[PDB]
């Protein structure tokens, strides 16, 4: 007896592994992305209110109230919204529903942890388009993007705000991508879990340029500082949504009911109490704190436009040596690149307390 060859993709992710390593070593954890603080009180109270009354199965597509709350934010009808058990499931069910053997999916490099494994589990082939890393920062070359499209290309997987670059795609880029999508009749998968976490002008969404072929992915955990609630969603053309709900039905059936209920109220309260605005400000403050502290050490730092991650170069170091000698956990570039990753490039998560960030700067400082 033996497991199916498919399970070769079932390797423990470097993200939770680093987290365990960090707890064991007593190191400041600036690797895997999850807030050090608890979620806002209005969300906790909304969930408490749901416990005891909404504990049983919810429809696969989602609790009616959550679908309506999301529909209002996205200006679509409830039937074009499907609630999944985290954006993680949304992404898995989408690749599973859009590509298969013989199909190709374009993925930008550096990429998010689940893209390639999901592509592989769908039996599809992924074609990577590495973004250019200049002294100014990461930059997308649309020529290189177009040069990657082929007769078998069925979908394009985009992520903005982008993890780990912190890049936010501008109007001209989305327009250009929407244009290529239409010209080759491609499906557009847009991972926008950090859609409310940007530091500049509010970005425009890819779905505005190509609504008939775009699937927008969101996450309550990345919206409301509650990564462990496992509530996410897909907003896309309604004609395809019933199928997607059909697919997530077999993976986990439905998302946690009381959490879906609490999030529904929370999404509305957040919009009217200026929560996202205050959150962005709290994060910008910490982004600058980290960036400035690393600059002062004489390090090369690429200031992000979104998400709570930033990348920097620490010459002559490797993640594991750092976590043990400096007692600071970071995620190495090799985690986001398939082959030949940039030398000495690390990702920092700054969704931590200011104290934790200062502690990390002090420790990295001594070990220069």
Q: Which does 12 bind (CB under 5 to 8 A by kind): a copy of itself, ligand PLP, ligand HCI, none?
A: a copy of itself
Q: Which does 222 bind (CB under 5 to 8 A by kind): ligand HCI, a copy of itself, ligand PLP, none?
A: ligand PLP
Shortest Å, Cβ 214 to ligand HCI: 22
Q: Is 33 in the site for ligand HCI (CB under 6 A)?
A: yes
Q: Name the residue among 121, 93, 96 with its Cα closest to residue 6.
A: 121
How many of the other CB atoms lie within 10 Å of CB of 80?
19
Nearest to ligand HCI by Cβ — which residue? 33
- Compare residues 121 and 142 and give the one whose CB is closer to a copy of itself: 121
- Compare residues 153 and 163 and give the one whose CB is closer to ligand HCI: 163
User: Are 286 and 357 in contact, with CB atoms under 8 Å apart?
Assistant: yes
What φ, ψ does residue 126 adopt, rounded to 5°?
Answer: -105, 135
- Compare residues 83 and 326 and give the one whose CB is closer to ligand PLP: 83
Q: Which does 136 bind (CB under 5 to 8 A by kind): ligand HCI, ligand PLP, a copy of itself, none?
A: none
Shortest Å, Cβ 268 to ligand HCI: 26
- The contacts of residue 221 (CB under 8 Å, 6+ apart) are 86, 87, 193, 227, 228, 229, 230, 231, 232
Query: Strands, DSSP E only, in the chain?
Result: 28-29, 81-84, 104-109, 125-130, 132-133, 138-139, 153-159, 187-191, 214-219, 232-235, 300-302, 309-313, 328-329, 331-332, 345-349
Question: How far is residue 87 CA from its own chain's centroid?
Answer: 8
Shortest Å, Cβ 121 to a copy of itself: 6
**CA–CA separation, 14 and 163 (whole Å):** 15
- The contacts of residue 260 (CB under 8 Å, 6+ apart) are 58, 62, 63, 65, 66, 83, 231
Span 263-302, contacts to ligand HCI by CB under 6 A: none
Shortest Å, Cβ 125 to a copy of itself: 14
**CA–CA separation, 213 and 179 (whole Å):** 11
Span 230-259, contacts to ligand HCI by CB under 6 A: 253
Shortest Å, Cβ 120 to ligand PLP: 17
Alpha-helical runs (H) found in 122-256: 142-146, 171-183, 220-223, 241-251
Locus of tokens 């807030």 = 35
Candidates 163, 190, 219, 260; binder of ligand HCI (CB under 6 A) is 163
Shortest Å, Cβ 228 to a copy of itself: 3
Q: Which does 159 bind (CB under 5 to 8 A by kind): a copy of itself, ligand PLP, ligand HCI, none?
A: ligand PLP
Candidates 6, 10, 13, 37; binder of ligand HCI (CB under 6 A) is 13
**CA–CA separation, 304 and 298 (whole Å):** 18
- Site pattern 116..155 for ligand HCI (x: CB under 6 A): ----------------------------------------
**CA–CA separation, 185 and 328 (whole Å):** 46
Residue 55 half-sphere exposure toward CB, CA atoms < 13 A: 5
Shortest Å, Cβ 185 to ligand HCI: 30
What φ, ψ does residue 140 adopt, rounded to 5°?
Answer: -90, 125
DSSP 8-state code for residue 164: T
Shortest Å, Cβ 294 to ligand HCI: 19
- Site pattern 80..99 for ligand HCI (x: CB under 6 A): --------x-----------
Q: Is 165 in the site for ligand HCI (CB under 6 A)?
A: no
Nearest to ligand PLP by Cβ — which residue? 86
Helix (H) or strand (E) holding 281: helix 275-295
- Compare residues 187 and 348 and give the one whose CB is closer to ligand HCI: 348
Residues in touch with ligand PLP (CB under 6 A): 86-88, 112, 159, 163, 191, 193, 219, 221-222, 227, 232, 253
- Point out which residues bind ligand HCI (CB under 6 A): 13, 15, 32-33, 88, 113-114, 163, 253
């Amino acid at each position: 007896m033996r497991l199916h060859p498919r399970t070769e993709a079932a390797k423990e992710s470097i993200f939770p592994r680093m987290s365990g390593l960090a707890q064991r070593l007593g190191a400041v954890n600036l690797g895997q992305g999850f807030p050090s603080n608890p979620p806002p009180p209005f969300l906790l109270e909304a969930v408490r209110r749901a416990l005891g009354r909404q504990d049983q199965y919810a429809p696969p597509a989602g609790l009616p109230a959550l679908r309506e709350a999301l529909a209002e934010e996205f200006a679509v009808e409830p039937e074009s919204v499907v609630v999944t058990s985290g954006a993680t499931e949304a992404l898995y069910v989408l690749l599973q529903s859009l590509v298969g053997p013989g199909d190709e999916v374009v993925v930008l490099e550096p990429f998010f942890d689940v893209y390639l494994p999901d592509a592989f589990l769908a039996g599809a082939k992924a074609r990577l388009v590495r973004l250019d890393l200049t002294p100014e920062g990461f930059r997308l070359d649309l020529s290189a993007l177009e040069k990657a499209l082929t007769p078998r290309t069925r979908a394009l997987l985009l992520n903005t705000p982008m993890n780990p670059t912190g890049l936010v795609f501008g109007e001209r880029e989305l327009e250009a991508i929407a244009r290529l999508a239409r010209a080759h009749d491609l499906f557009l998968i847009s991972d926008e879990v950090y859609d409310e976490l940007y530091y500049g002008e509010r970005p425009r969404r890819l779905r505005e340029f190509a609504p008939e072929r775009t699937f927008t992915v969101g996450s309550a955990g990345k919206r409301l500082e509650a990564t462990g609630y496992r509530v996410g969603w897909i907003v896309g053309p309604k004609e395809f949504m019933p199928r997607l709900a059909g697919m997530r039905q077999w993976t986990s059936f439905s998302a946690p009911t009381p959490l879906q209920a609490g999030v529904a109220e929370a999404l509305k309260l957040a919009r009217r109490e200026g929560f996202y605005e205050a959150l962005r400000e709290g994060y910008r403050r910490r982004r600058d704190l980290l960036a400035g502290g690393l600059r002062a050490m004489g390090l090369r730092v690429y200031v992000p436009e979104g998400t709570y991650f930033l990348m920097a170069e620490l010459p002559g170091w490797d993640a594991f040596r750092l976590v043990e000698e400096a007692r600071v956990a970071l995620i190495p570039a090799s985690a986001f690149y398939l082959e030949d990753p940039p030398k000495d490039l690390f990702r920092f998560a700054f969704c931590k307390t200011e104290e934790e960030l200062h502690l990390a700067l002090e420790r990295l400082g001594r070990v220069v």
